[PDB]
Amino acid sequence: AGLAVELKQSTAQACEKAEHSTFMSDLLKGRLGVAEFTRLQEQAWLFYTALEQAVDAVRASGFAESLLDPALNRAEVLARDLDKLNGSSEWRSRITASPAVIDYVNRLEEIRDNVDGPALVAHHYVRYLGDLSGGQVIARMMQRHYGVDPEALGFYHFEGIAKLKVYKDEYREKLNNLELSDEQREHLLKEATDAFVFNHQVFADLGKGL
Numbered sequence: 001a002g003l004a005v006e007l008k009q010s011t012a013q014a015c016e017k018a019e020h021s022t023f024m025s026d027l028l029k030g031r032l033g034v035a036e037f038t039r040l041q042e043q044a045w046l047f048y049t050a051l052e053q054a055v056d057a058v059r060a061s062g063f064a065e066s067l068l069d070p071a072l073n074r075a076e077v078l079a080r081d082l083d084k085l086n087g088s089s090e091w092r093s094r095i096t097a098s099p100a101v102i103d104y105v106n107r108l109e110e111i112r113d114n115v116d117g118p119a120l121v122a123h124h125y126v127r128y129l130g131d132l133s134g135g136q137v138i139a140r141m142m143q144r145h146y147g148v149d150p151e152a153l154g155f156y157h158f159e160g161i162a163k164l165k166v167y168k169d170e171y172r173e174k175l176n177n178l179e180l181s182d183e184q185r186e187h188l189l190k191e192a193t194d195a196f197v198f199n200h201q202v203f204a205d206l207g208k209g210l
């Protein structure tokens, strides 16, 4: 009863486990630096590119159109942040995908090629709402601990979204307003737990140096 609530309760466990990753613990508690965080955003640009391709394909099908806000696009802003973070655009000629990111990218392409709307909304919820929530905390700890230029953190700032609290409330309303069959609803709820597992292994690779 209530998709936004049912999503938040089903993934509440994995969400708490997502803040406890070894890489993300060291990163926010001041133990790493600008270099390791730049590695995070380089993997992010890889699967955020594959995600928004799936978003574009699902949006063109007319599924969850109001939810797939283009103002949430992160790939270009990441490319603009990686230019500053690397001090040069020559990161594009040497990006590498850790195994878990490749596994994350393959699934997002699978959702794209199947135009799997409900599975897309699951990944859309897990990444973007995390960006609009924990990403605000991650962005602050980057400035506080490492003095990163606030303009190399544009990934965590949404220029189309002034009131983040209002928008996150508006986002959950569109989640509750989605017209999903019981088959679609379970498929979405399962992929959401899958989406957290995909991210968890991305951060396990980062902490392992893969």
Ligand code: COH
Pocket: 004, 007, 008, 015, 018, 019, 020, 024, 028, 125, 126, 127, 129, 130, 131, 133, 134, 135, 137, 138, 196, 199, 200
């Ligand atoms: C340092 C804190 C921190 C970290 C590292 C973090 C890391 C991640 C992460 C990395 C793997 C992912 C995929 C997410 C994904 C999410 N986070 Co956070 N989150 C964090 C603090 C929060 C906070 C605070 C909220 C607000 C709601 C809540 O339940 O706490 C949050 C909410 C979310 C939501 C929305 C829940 C809802 O309202 O339905 C998603 C999705 N997330 N988060």
